[PDB]
Amino acid sequence: SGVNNTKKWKMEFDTRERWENPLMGWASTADPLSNMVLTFSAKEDAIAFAEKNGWSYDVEEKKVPKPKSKSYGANFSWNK
Amino acid sequence: PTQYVPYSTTRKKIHEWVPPSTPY
Amino acid sequence: PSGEERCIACKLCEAICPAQAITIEAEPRADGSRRTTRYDIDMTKCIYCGFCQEACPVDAIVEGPNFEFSTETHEELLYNKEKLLNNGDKWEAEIAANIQADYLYR
Amino acid sequence: SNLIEVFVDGQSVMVEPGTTVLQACEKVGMQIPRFCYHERLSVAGNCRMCLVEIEKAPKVVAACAMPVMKGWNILTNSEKSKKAREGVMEFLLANHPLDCPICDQGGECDLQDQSMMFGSDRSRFLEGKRAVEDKNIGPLVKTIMTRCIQCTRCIRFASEIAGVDDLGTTGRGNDMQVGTYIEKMFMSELSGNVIDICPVGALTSKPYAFTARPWETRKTESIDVMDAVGSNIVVSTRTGEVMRILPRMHEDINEEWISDKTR
Amino acid sequence: FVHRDTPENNPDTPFDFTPENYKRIEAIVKNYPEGHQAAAVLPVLDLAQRQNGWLPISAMNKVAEVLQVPPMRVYEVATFYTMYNRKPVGKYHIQVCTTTPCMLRDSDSILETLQRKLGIKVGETTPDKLFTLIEVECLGACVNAPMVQINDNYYEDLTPKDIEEIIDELKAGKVPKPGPRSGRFCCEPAGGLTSLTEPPKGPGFGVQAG
Amino acid sequence: ITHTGQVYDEKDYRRVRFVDRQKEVNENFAIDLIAQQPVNEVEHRIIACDGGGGALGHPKVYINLDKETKTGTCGYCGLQFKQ
Amino acid sequence: FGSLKDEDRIFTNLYGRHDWRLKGALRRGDWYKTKEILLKGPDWILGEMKTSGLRGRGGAGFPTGLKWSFMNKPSDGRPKYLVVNADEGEPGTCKDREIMRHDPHKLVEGCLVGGRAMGARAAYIYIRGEFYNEASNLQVAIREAYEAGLIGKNACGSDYDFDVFVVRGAGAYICGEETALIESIEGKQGKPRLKPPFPADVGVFGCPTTVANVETVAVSPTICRRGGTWFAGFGRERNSGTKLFNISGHVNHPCTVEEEMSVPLKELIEKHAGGVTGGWDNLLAVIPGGSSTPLIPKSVCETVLMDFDALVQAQTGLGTAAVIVMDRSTDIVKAIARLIEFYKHESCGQCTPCREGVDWMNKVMARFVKGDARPAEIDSLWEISKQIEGHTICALGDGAAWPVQGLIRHFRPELEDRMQRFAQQH
Amino acid sequence: LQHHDYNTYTFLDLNLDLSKFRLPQP
Ligand SMILES: Cc1cc2nc3c(=O)[nH]c(=O)nc-3n(C[C@H](O)[C@H](O)[C@H](O)COP(=O)(O)O)c2cc1C
Ligand code: SF4
Ligand code: SF4
Ligand code: SF4
Ligand code: SF4
Ligand code: FES
Ligand code: FES
Ligand SMILES: [Zn+2]
């Protein structure tokens, strides 16, 4: 329930092939930019990185939990 | 005090449908 | 002693290995217990730090005394669970004596 | 109008009247360590791991519960509200069975972290521990309930989010066990959410019992296709095969919950 | 706290309030507020206990049925309170008060005597299933400390021997003069009534003006 | 063959490896070794399980041998305890 | 200075001695000015208690008038209610068992006198289920009263309507708690509710509700009949009025006497009741308010006076004013140890502190009686004690910590020796 | 000696008898 990992924006490259290795069965990948996830503090700065580096981008708006009204007294209401 | 051979020991991860041997 | 392998696949030996050497995948054994289907230490990747010895809660993975395991082929150096378990059975008597001598220190 | 001003460590946040002390800290950005409080579940106050210290007040207050009043400055990092957490964490851990390398909520534990950040470096419980008896809640949820911190979020979800009203507390004292009195399986859709909502790893998923451990799982955010609600979900993949699908929050479509079928 | 179905204690044991019991059931409800029946689970659960001491899983399900509440709701109430017994209860069911007040005034003393007389361990029913001994906590009535409640009898101020006498009375015959077997009435200074030895003022005595 | 019965198969393209060189498999498989372990009878409702030897054993866990119906099994040793 | 006159003693029927039934009650003249009082006004009744300055007769001490004043606020369309808790789980509270059994009526008119003060539609009396016989006595008394028309709609020939009910307790000390009495009345598990929504605004069946110790409700009629002043005079400053004192354990004649408050502690065993068994010097310690309050050693006992604040200055609580006395013939380490056993067998377990903390102190306390534990552990128990004192949802965790704190505070050398005794024999 | 003897249903049955007196429900 911690929210400290939902704070900074991250841009992540598209996932690619992960074929099984014949000798040991370890996962093997041919994509170099797979494990790379860069962290950017604000949406504007991350968009800038994609434009100057020439990678295509598809930004997703942050969705933050909506305020929810809670009060211990309210559920004690037999009425409802 | 008085040649190995390495191999994967895990199973098949994705089992594969087998076609029906009954012809149609 | 009973004969049940110590590892319970918590997989933090994999987490703290500096070189990414240990690969562990697990599934509940029919007994219902938790065991590793595959435990592969890539010794060529391993830099013999000894943290895995440190990290294990059940102390299933240990740094054994033998240093003479030079091999003709690269594949032999990659080790699966069966080689390590076999290595464990062969050197268990000395490993037990060594852990016996140094556990108070740790 | 309807905007009290309360200070969280002197930050003069302003909140609608009726917002809990925990909620006031959230808008400033501070997080009260919490167990038994879930946003879409009723406030229960069971853990009291959220005790904070409103200024000029004799006792510390329950964050999730006290409606913040006018001009009460919350001191979330005081010398008191830390002894109110260093001493609660002492208790939750005291009766806890240390099988963290069995508990597949290893890195997904809201109780090791809070211990590891807000709790205590060592233990003083030289006495013995308790044990409860594992029962069957069904074929999806493995209840190794000797892990339970009696936080009653299950009994809430199982009554409030889903209308099962089966899970309940049984007994009093240190052997209050939150399991079905008679062994009747918890059969309902929305069932698997209990896993995700129990911060302890007491009851967890039986299929995904011991296949992985969370730090390894690479998490890709995708869409539910099993049903037409199109619930948002996160597919956790390790070395290229999917290991679990757990919910990711979409206010409008699935707000933190997913069906038994699509997980 | 788990009901593992057993041939004896399981719903095969049918439970239903006697025509007379059901009557009792309804009036209770009205005692509580209208539109509110759930509040009566305890009082009802108590009459299921009055009907039968065992009160098996079948009986609780009926209680929930009659009271139209989540069955668990009844299960939770039965488990929380010690008054309800989810296991068979001895005909006499003596309970010995062993909180510090009674212990200080010898409560423990009594226990040893009763174990020997019933010739059985503390916590289980006699083979004769005649009496059941349990170490219950403060039952009120401390001024009279030595104490052993038997189905509400609440005997008080008892010296070890007295109980043996009482138990015998229970073993042969019935109604063994339940109450303080001492010479002090209800609670009274053994010396007398220092509080009020005069006659009580009558109605409207020194009633203040206004 | 092995613990989880790894069987590079008659048609696999990997069974080629063992040609002229043996495979690593285990006798005294553990799967059966604890099953071969006697059930530790106990008097108390709950019992500990240091794994044997304290620091040299495993995280100490208290098992509830409360139901004869089930012999508690410490999740670490797989040792069944008979109430 | 105590020594209240028999006339002033409110509960004359104490010890019985006068028919507990109505005809005895009429000779008592308990129903003498009831119509007048209600007629005067609800505001007149609360003026009487405010002038009385009566403190809560239950374990918690608060101005009785202010508590009743809180739900005197205008009705919001929910029926206001009265809850009388006749449960007294605390050891040494046979205090209430008397009024209920001996003088049921006093409480019946206490209920309606109190009822119009809060404008309660009806009153529910939660007598502990243990007392089945006690219940038999009150509803016989309640039945008499309605037959008379004293209670019911148009009660006592007046506009006001009241109905009084008796509810069965089920052997729980916690049921006694104010928010938990309600939940038992509501029919859910007896688990204290949280403090923010005060029982005035939310409550029994979610309607406004107020909870009073049976002594508090019973003293109401007289306080109005005798006037707040008469009652106000006997007390000391904030402390005021006579409160029943129960002396149990190591005293020659254990009894409940309603002698005046502010009594020298040395005086009440020496003058009334029975002098401490074995002599006033055979007093290892005194538990003034019952198990919840910390015990005070003989050193200060004589100097102490029995008042809510007096004990406070002394670090102890008047509470239920149940005096439990321990001669030099008792293993206190084991005496307090069973009170912690009294609380592990009883706390609801709803809150983390109390659940594990009280069990943790029980385990340490049992080792302390044996002497197995080392001397350093003692301080931990203290530290464990205050973690539970300020963090609990209800007061029982408050209550469990205080006896532990008292044992360490005044009897720390004795526990160390028990520590020492075991270490020597090895 | 009314206290000295009462039946298991005294409380409940007595109450039912009082039901008639009991004022109307909320
Ligand atoms: C654990 C616990 C048990 C209690 N038991 C009782 C009880 O048996 N009787 C009682 O009158 N008050 C009891 N109380 C106090 C009540 O909650 C409440 O404060 C009191 O009855 C109010 O009475 P008064 O305001 O008239 O003094 C208890 C409190 C706690 C925390
Ligand atoms: S080796 Fe030790 S650490 Fe690595 S998994 Fe097996 S047990 Fe856990
Ligand atoms: S829950 Fe599982 S992981 Fe979190 S602490 Fe208890 S055991 Fe370790
Ligand atoms: S199970 Fe998980 S959720 Fe239900 S109580 Fe125990 S911990 Fe809280
Ligand atoms: S303290 Fe916490 S646990 Fe003990 S009774 Fe009050 S609420 Fe229940
Ligand atoms: S988080 Fe504060 S009450 Fe549970
Ligand atoms: S402790 Fe035995 S009745 Fe009070
Ligand atoms: Zn083990």
Side-chain angles (χ1 to χ4, degrees):
Chain A
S1 183
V3 72
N4 191 27
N5 284 358
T6 315
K7 288 306 191 307
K8 326 219 124 258
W9 289 70
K10 286 185 185 16
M11 66 174 282
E12 157 79 277
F13 297 67
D14 71 307
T15 84
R16 282 301 167 96
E17 210 180 0
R18 223 157 263 117
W19 71 89
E20 206 148 14
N21 206 72
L23 173 69
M24 295 300 293
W26 299 331
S28 310
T29 314
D31 180 44
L33 295 174
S34 64
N35 276 326
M36 185 166 64
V37 295
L38 309 177
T39 289
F40 297 99
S41 178
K43 176 175 124 194
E44 296 302 320
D45 309 331
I47 285 196
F49 214 74
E51 267 145 4
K52 64 179 180 180
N53 276 303
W55 307 309
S56 295
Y57 64 90
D58 65 9
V59 64
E60 326 200 302
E61 297 301 313
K62 184 177 186 181
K63 61 180 68 180
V64 287
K66 295 180 182 297
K68 302 172 179 56
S69 56
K70 318 280 298 180
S71 297
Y72 176 77
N75 64 34
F76 301 119
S77 175
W78 277 71
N79 307 8
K80 301 301 290 187
Chain B
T2 179
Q3 293 177 335
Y4 160 72
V5 298
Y7 63 102
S8 63
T9 299
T10 188
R11 294 176 64 186
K12 291 303 171 296
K13 335 193 70 171
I14 312 304
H15 307 287
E16 297 167 352
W17 184 68
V18 62
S21 178
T22 300
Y24 288 94
Chain C
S2 58
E4 198 66 18
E5 62 185 342
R6 285 177 177 267
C7 202
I8 61 171
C10 54
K11 292 174 65 175
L12 61 80
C13 49
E14 174 192 66
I16 191 66
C17 200
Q20 294 300 320
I22 317 177
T23 299
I24 294 169
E25 182 178 2
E27 293 177 350
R29 188 164 45 87
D31 188 13
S33 178
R34 167 186 202 161
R35 294 288 172 238
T36 61
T37 41
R38 178 220 282 140
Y39 192 89
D40 294 345
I41 294 169
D42 184 334
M43 297 296 180
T44 59
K45 271 200 273 143
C46 194
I47 62 100
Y48 301 81
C49 45
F51 295 161
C52 44
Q53 190 173 355
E54 299 302 320
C56 199
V58 187
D59 197 8
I61 178 75
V62 284
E63 293 283 21
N66 196 41
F67 49 97
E68 300 89 320
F69 59 88
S70 301
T71 57
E72 294 177 350
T73 80
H74 187 286
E75 63 185 342
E76 276 166 64
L77 267 204
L78 276 66
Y79 282 169
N80 90 313
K81 191 171 86 154
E82 260 315 294
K83 172 103 197 94
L84 295 174
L85 265 180
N86 158 67
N87 266 337
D89 273 13
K90 170 182 180 179
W91 301 92
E92 179 78 32
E94 182 178 2
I95 291 164
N98 280 20
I99 309 285
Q100 184 65 260
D102 184 1
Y103 86 91
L104 275 66
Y105 296 95
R106 42 198 73 191
Chain D
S1 60
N2 292 338
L3 266 190
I4 305 302
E5 177 282 310
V6 304
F7 303 90
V8 175
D9 287 356
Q11 302 311 326
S12 182
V13 61
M14 308 197 67
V15 293
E16 300 289 326
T19 58
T20 85
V21 162
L22 188 147
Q23 271 154 31
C25 304
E26 309 300 286
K27 297 183 71 68
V28 154
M30 296 297 103
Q31 299 295 100
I32 304 301
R34 66 184 182 277
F35 281 126
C36 55
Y37 167 65
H38 186 279
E39 297 85 357
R40 293 178 179 83
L41 279 184
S42 64
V43 159
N46 291 284
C47 71
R48 300 296 299 278
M49 168 47 199
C50 68
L51 286 167
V52 296
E53 194 177 29
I54 303 301
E55 192 163 0
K56 55 197 60 175
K59 67 174 54 180
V60 295
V61 303
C64 55
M66 291 288 302
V68 62
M69 291 177 72
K70 182 72 200 57
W72 290 95
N73 183 1
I74 302 96
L75 294 171
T76 62
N77 193 1
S78 177
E79 186 66 25
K80 171 61 174 299
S81 62
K82 291 186 282 183
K83 301 301 290 187
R85 293 169 184 170
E86 184 178 2
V88 174
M89 184 66 75
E90 187 179 0
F91 293 145
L92 296 174
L93 290 201
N95 280 108
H96 209 92
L98 62 80
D99 62 356
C100 285
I102 294 162
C103 186
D104 61 356
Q105 291 181 359
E108 287 170 350
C109 178
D110 199 359
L111 195 149
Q112 64 180 20
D113 286 330
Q114 298 183 6
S115 180
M116 187 62 201
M117 297 296 180
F118 299 156
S120 46
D121 295 337
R122 295 178 179 83
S123 181
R124 332 208 299 266
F125 190 58
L126 310 173
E127 301 64 28
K129 299 180 182 297
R130 55 176 182 183
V132 175
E133 288 290 353
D134 291 345
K135 303 309 173 67
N136 186 204
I137 197 186
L140 300 179
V141 190
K142 179 177 52 181
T143 58
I144 294 169
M145 184 176 282
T146 66
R147 293 182 183 174
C148 205
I149 53 152
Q150 285 89 10
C151 68
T152 79
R153 292 182 183 174
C154 55
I155 294 169
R156 279 170 278 162
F157 164 93
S159 306
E160 301 182 1
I161 310 306
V164 188
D165 60 271
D166 284 357
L167 273 57
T169 45
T170 59
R172 59 176 182 183
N174 220 344
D175 65 9
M176 185 160 87
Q177 63 180 20
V178 175
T180 60
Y181 177 77
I182 45 182
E183 294 302 320
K184 62 180 68 180
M185 66 174 282
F186 187 51
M187 189 173 59
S188 84
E189 70 278 333
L190 295 174
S191 179
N193 306 320
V194 195
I195 292 103
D196 295 333
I197 288 166
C198 181
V200 175
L203 61 84
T204 186
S205 64
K206 189 184 262 78
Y208 181 87
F210 303 118
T211 62
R213 179 68 77 193
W215 48 81
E216 216 170 352
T217 68
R218 291 178 178 172
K219 294 180 181 178
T220 62
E221 293 177 350
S222 83
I223 307 301
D224 187 1
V225 175
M226 296 297 103
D227 272 306
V229 63
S231 71
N232 273 14
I233 62 100
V234 165
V235 165
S236 306
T237 189
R238 261 197 48 220
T239 76
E241 70 281 5
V242 175
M243 306 258 83
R244 184 180 65 255
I245 294 169
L246 60 80
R248 64 182 181 88
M249 177 178 73
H250 189 317
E251 298 302 320
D252 317 327
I253 64 100
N254 71 300
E255 70 281 5
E256 257 153 27
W257 291 273
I258 55 174
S259 298
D260 285 345
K261 200 191 282 187
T262 184
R263 64 183 294 166
Chain E
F1 292 106
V2 166
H3 180 296
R4 315 165 194 62
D5 292 0
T6 182
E8 311 77 1
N9 182 1
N10 79 302
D12 190 1
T13 52
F15 184 63
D16 183 63
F17 300 112
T18 78
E20 201 177 1
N21 285 0
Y22 264 123
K23 307 182 313 186
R24 299 181 174 88
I25 307 301
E26 174 190 2
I28 307 175
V29 187
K30 302 181 53 182
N31 305 345
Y32 281 106
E34 186 64 7
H36 303 279
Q37 311 172 354
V41 285
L42 289 77
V44 167
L45 200 49
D46 194 47
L47 188 147
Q49 199 168 200
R50 297 294 181 192
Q51 170 71 18
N52 306 326
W54 187 310
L55 177 63
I57 192 66
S58 179
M60 293 177 182
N61 250 320
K62 263 299 179 185
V63 171
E65 173 181 354
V66 175
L67 296 157
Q68 301 86 9
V69 299
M72 182 63 185
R73 183 57 57 85
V74 170
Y75 293 156
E76 295 188 65
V77 158
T79 50
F80 196 86
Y81 304 89
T82 69
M83 184 66 75
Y84 311 128
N85 321 116
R86 304 178 287 98
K87 295 180 182 297
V89 58
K91 161 192 179 183
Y92 292 113
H93 192 202
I94 183 168
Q95 292 177 335
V96 175
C97 184
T98 67
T99 313
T100 201
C102 304
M103 154 176 90
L104 292 173
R105 203 64 172 88
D106 303 0
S107 73
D108 46 2
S109 177
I110 278 179
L111 171 69
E112 299 183 359
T113 292
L114 274 66
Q115 274 187 298
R116 164 204 319 176
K117 309 314 177 185
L118 270 64
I120 195 64
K121 61 180 180 295
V122 50
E124 301 294 0
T125 317
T126 64
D128 312 352
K129 303 308 178 59
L130 198 48
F131 308 72
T132 285
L133 177 63
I134 314 175
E135 184 173 347
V136 70
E137 291 191 2
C138 182
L139 300 170
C142 299
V143 63
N144 299 11
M147 178 178 73
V148 286
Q149 180 184 359
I150 310 177
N151 299 348
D152 181 46
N153 285 9
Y154 259 102
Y155 290 83
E156 304 176 8
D157 201 2
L158 309 174
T159 76
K161 306 155 301 305
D162 311 354
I163 309 100
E164 168 266 355
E165 171 263 9
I166 304 176
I167 303 173
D168 305 348
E169 296 173 302
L170 304 143
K171 291 174 65 175
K174 60 177 181 180
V175 201
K177 179 59 163 60
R181 309 304 287 271
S182 181
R184 49 162 51 181
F185 307 95
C186 295
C187 296
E188 71 175 7
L193 322 176
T194 67
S195 58
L196 308 88
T197 172
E198 271 78 334
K201 328 305 300 182
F205 160 80
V207 42
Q208 162 61 208
Chain F
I1 308 179
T2 198
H3 283 94
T4 321
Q6 170 59 10
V7 47
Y8 276 105
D9 170 58
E10 61 180 6
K11 305 177 55 181
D12 288 345
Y13 80 98
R14 319 153 198 83
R15 212 179 63 169
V16 297
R17 74 171 50 84
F18 321 88
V19 173
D20 216 349
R21 32 194 174 98
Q22 50 70 36
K23 175 180 176 181
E24 204 72 18
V25 73
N26 230 349
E27 292 195 5
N28 289 337
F29 288 96
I31 315 178
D32 310 346
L33 300 197
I34 224 61
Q36 298 172 7
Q37 198 66 8
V39 201
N40 306 349
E41 172 83 22
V42 195
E43 327 301 341
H44 299 165
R45 301 179 67 247
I46 177 181
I47 84 179
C49 193
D50 300 327
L56 304 180
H58 70 83
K60 182 183 191 69
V61 293
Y62 297 68
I63 298 87
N64 199 357
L65 288 50
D66 189 24
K67 44 187 175 183
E68 45 286 346
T69 75
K70 299 174 55 60
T71 53
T73 56
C74 56
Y76 295 90
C77 296
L79 287 172
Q80 316 212 5
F81 304 99
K82 184 185 176 179
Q83 315 74 27
Chain G
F1 315 111
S3 185
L4 188 66
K5 301 304 301 176
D6 296 10
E7 59 177 13
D8 298 351
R9 283 188 166 88
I10 292 184
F11 305 100
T12 68
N13 197 6
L14 174 58
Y15 306 162
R17 322 307 297 106
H18 325 95
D19 186 1
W20 60 290
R21 290 163 299 184
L22 177 69
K23 61 180 68 180
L26 288 179
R27 300 169 222 152
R28 294 193 297 274
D30 76 313
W31 294 90
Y32 179 78
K33 253 213 163 65
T34 312
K35 195 286 172 300
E36 296 72 9
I37 297 175
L38 311 178
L39 175 57
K40 305 299 92 183
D43 67 9
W44 186 88
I45 311 166
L46 294 174
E48 295 302 320
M49 294 300 293
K50 298 292 180 65
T51 49
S52 156
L54 176 63
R55 299 296 299 278
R57 281 321 186 232
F62 271 130
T64 284
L66 295 174
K67 184 185 193 301
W68 293 1
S69 179
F70 297 148
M71 67 174 282
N72 208 26
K73 296 292 184 289
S75 173
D76 302 354
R78 293 182 183 174
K80 291 182 292 297
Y81 272 119
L82 178 63
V83 175
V84 176
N85 63 34
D87 207 283
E88 292 307 333
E90 200 147 336
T93 298
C94 192
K95 188 180 68 65
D96 305 321
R97 190 164 187 264
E98 323 296 348
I99 319 305
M100 311 177 312
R101 169 185 52 176
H102 301 233
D103 190 355
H105 284 267
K106 181 138 300 181
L107 176 63
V108 186
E109 63 185 342
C111 293
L112 177 63
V113 159
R116 184 176 179 83
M118 69 193 88
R121 181 182 293 176
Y124 293 78
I125 310 181
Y126 192 77
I127 64 97
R128 179 139 53 91
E130 265 61 13
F131 314 105
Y132 178 87
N133 187 18
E134 260 66 22
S136 178
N137 304 139
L138 177 63
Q139 293 177 335
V140 158
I142 292 197
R143 186 226 53 232
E144 287 284 5
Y146 287 114
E147 266 142 357
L150 297 169
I151 35 163
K153 61 180 180 295
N154 309 357
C156 183
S158 64
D159 63 356
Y160 185 74
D161 293 345
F162 177 80
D163 183 1
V164 62
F165 303 104
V166 178
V167 173
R168 299 286 293 172
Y173 174 40
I174 190 64
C175 284
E177 204 271 349
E178 180 185 20
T179 55
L181 199 70
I182 302 179
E183 279 202 346
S184 178
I185 304 301
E186 274 181 30
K188 290 174 65 175
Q189 257 180 332
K191 275 177 180 322
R193 258 186 262 272
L194 281 53
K195 290 317 302 169
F198 292 104
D201 312 358
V202 190
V204 69
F205 299 96
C207 295
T209 319
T210 286
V211 178
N213 173 241
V214 296
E215 194 190 332
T216 316
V217 175
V219 298
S220 178
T222 61
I223 280 188
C224 295
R225 183 170 294 107
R226 212 75 174 181
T229 60
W230 168 90
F231 192 78
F234 309 120
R236 182 179 180 274
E237 214 273 327
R238 67 198 72 179
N239 317 315
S240 178
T242 189
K243 184 185 193 301
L244 275 66
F245 295 143
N246 196 309
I247 62 100
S248 47
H250 298 302
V251 296
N252 277 342
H253 296 301
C255 65
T256 319
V257 62
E258 32 162 353
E259 183 178 2
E260 213 280 285
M261 196 156 49
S262 64
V263 64
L265 194 37
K266 184 169 71 172
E267 218 193 285
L268 61 80
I269 61 100
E270 183 178 2
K271 183 185 193 301
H272 298 55
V276 164
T277 296
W280 188 86
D281 291 4
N282 296 17
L283 171 58
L284 201 162
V286 171
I287 297 169
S291 71
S292 300
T293 82
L295 61 80
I296 191 66
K298 185 173 63 59
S299 60
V300 194
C301 292
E302 71 288 357
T303 71
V304 174
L305 275 66
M306 296 266 67
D307 289 345
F308 293 94
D309 184 16
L311 307 201
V312 167
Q313 184 65 260
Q315 64 180 20
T316 184
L318 196 47
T320 77
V323 175
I324 293 169
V325 175
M326 310 166 52
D327 287 349
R328 303 291 178 175
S329 60
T330 59
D331 182 356
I332 183 171
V333 183
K334 178 59 163 60
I336 303 301
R338 177 64 180 86
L339 295 174
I340 293 166
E341 189 71 27
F342 178 75
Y343 292 146
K344 182 180 68 65
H345 287 286
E346 166 265 341
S347 63
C348 70
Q350 186 173 355
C351 55
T352 301
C354 176
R355 187 189 327 106
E356 284 76 347
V358 164
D359 211 356
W360 192 359
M361 292 177 182
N362 183 52
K363 295 180 182 297
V364 185
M365 221 61 215
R367 283 194 345 256
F368 275 178
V369 179
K370 292 189 292 185
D372 296 9
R374 87 199 52 111
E377 188 127 15
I378 306 174
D379 52 51
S380 186
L381 200 49
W382 181 275
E383 314 144 16
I384 295 151
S385 178
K386 298 183 71 68
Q387 294 300 320
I388 186 167
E389 212 195 316
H391 295 83
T392 41
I393 281 186
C394 76
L396 170 78
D398 293 345
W402 292 324
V404 176
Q405 261 159 322
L407 188 147
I408 300 158
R409 228 189 265 107
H410 320 288
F411 302 116
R412 185 176 179 83
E414 183 65 13
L415 177 63
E416 300 217 67
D417 289 345
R418 196 79 49 86
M419 301 297 103
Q420 184 65 260
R421 183 170 294 107
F422 183 77
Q424 298 270 316
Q425 64 180 20
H426 276 300
Chain H
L1 276 60
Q2 71 296 341
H3 46 279
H4 268 92
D5 62 356
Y6 286 119
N7 79 305
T8 68
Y9 287 121
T10 300
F11 173 92
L12 299 176
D13 302 9
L14 192 171
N15 193 335
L16 185 157
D17 308 346
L18 273 177
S19 172
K20 176 60 61 62
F21 301 82
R22 300 302 235 270
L23 189 152
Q25 278 69 213

